[PDB]
Amino acid sequence: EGRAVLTSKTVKDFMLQKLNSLDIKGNASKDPAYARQTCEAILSAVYSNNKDQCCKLLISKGVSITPFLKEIGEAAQNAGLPGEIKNGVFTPGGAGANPFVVPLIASASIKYPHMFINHNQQVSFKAYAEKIVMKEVTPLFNKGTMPTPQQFQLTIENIANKYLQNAS
């Protein structure tokens, strides 16, 4: 939106405008690498968010997310983003912190010092930021055989949620 208050989703709003004006697909249209590197890394973001979200509470139980990472690596293998594997475990190739949210959040970290001041706010900012791109990134998952962010996130979350509970 546009206003001298931008409250109720401020960055989220500017992040939303960026999200739309970032034209994740538009870049995928001009950049056949962008379309492919940010098509697997988006779901690799959920993959990592899964290892971030699941491991977050898991580091509290003293569990082992590696076996869970093995599961998101499945989705990360079946989704089309492979490239790493170890003791009976696999890791997705382009697995980072969301190539769409990185600069999206980088701009908002540069733009919104106030909202990004807290060490956990810019980290949480990218969490709902990888959720909006799913409205812009989903179309890159239309060409080929890629899973949707929500279909893949749930299947991933399903392993985060599986390791999430575990007696607790």
Contact 81, 42 (CB under 8 A): no
- The separation between CA 119 and the C-alpha centre of its own chain, rounded to angstroms, equals 19
Residue found under tokens 């890159």: 140
Chain center to CA of 137: 11
3-state secondary structure the chain: CCCCCCCCCCHHHHHHHHHHHHCHHHHHHHCCCHHHHHHHHHHHHHHHHHHHHHHHHHHHHCCCHHHHHHHHHHHHHHCCCCCEECCCCEECCCCCCCCCHHHHHHHHHHHCHHHHCCCCHHHHHHHHHHHHHHHHCHHHHCCCCCCCHHHHHHHHHHHHHHHHCCCC
In order of 12, 66, 162, the CA distances from 77 in angstroms are 31, 15, 19
Contact in structure between 11 and 111 (CB atoms under 8 Å): yes
Domains of the chain: 1-168 (1.10.4120.10)
Question: What was the experiment behind these coordinates?
Answer: NMR
Are the beta carbons of 19 and 26 closer than 8 angstroms?
Answer: no
CB 133 within 8 Å of CB 149? yes
